[PDB]
Structure 1
Amino acid sequence: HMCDAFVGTWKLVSSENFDDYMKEVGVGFATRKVAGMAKPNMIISVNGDVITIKSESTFKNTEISFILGQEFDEVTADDRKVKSTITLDGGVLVHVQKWDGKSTTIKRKREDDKLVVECVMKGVTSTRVYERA
Structure 2
Amino acid sequence: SFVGKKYKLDKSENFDEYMKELGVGLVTRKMGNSLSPTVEVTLEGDTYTLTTTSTFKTSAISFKLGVEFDEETLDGRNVKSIITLDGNKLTQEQKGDKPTTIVREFTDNELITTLTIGNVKCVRVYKAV
Residues 71 and 85 of structure 1 are in contact (CA less than 8 Å); yes or no, is this contact kept in structure 2?
Answer: yes
Contact 2:66 2:83 in 1 (8 A): yes
Residue 103 of structure 1 pairs with residue 99 of structure 2: yes
Alignment of structure 1 residues 1-133 onto 2, 5 Å: 4-99=1-96, 101-133=97-129
The one-letter code matched in structure 2 to 1:109 is E
CA offset at residue 90 of structure 1? Answer: 4.5
Amino acid at match of 2:67: Q
Deviation >3 Å, runs of 4+: none
Return the alpha-carbon distance in structure 2 between the equivalents of residues 113 and 25 of structure 1.
29
TM-score by length of 1: 0.87
Give the whole-Å Cα distance in 1 for the aligned partners of 2:87 and 2:123. 19
- Whole-angstrom distance in 1 between the partners of 2:4 and 2:30: 29
- TM-score of the aligned structures, taking structure 2 as reference length: 0.90
**Once the 2 structures are TM-superposed, how far is the Cα of residue 110 of structure 1 from its aligned partner?**
1.6
- Equivalent position amino acid for 1:119 in 2: L
**Residues matched between the structures, number:** 129
Q: Which runs of 5+ in 1 are unaligned?
A: none
Contact 1:16 1:128 in 2 (8 A): yes
The share of aligned pairs that are identical, in percent, is 46
Deviation of 1:31 after TM superposition, in Å, equals 1.4
State the Cα distance separating 1:76 from its structure 2 match.
3.1
- Structure 2 residue runs of 5 or longer lacking an equivalent are none
SS at match of 2:95: strand
Task: Give the superposition deviation at 1:21.
Answer: 1.1
SS in 2 for 1:68: coil
1:8-48 residue CA offsets vs partner (Å, 9 max, x unmatched): 11111111111111112122211110111111111211112
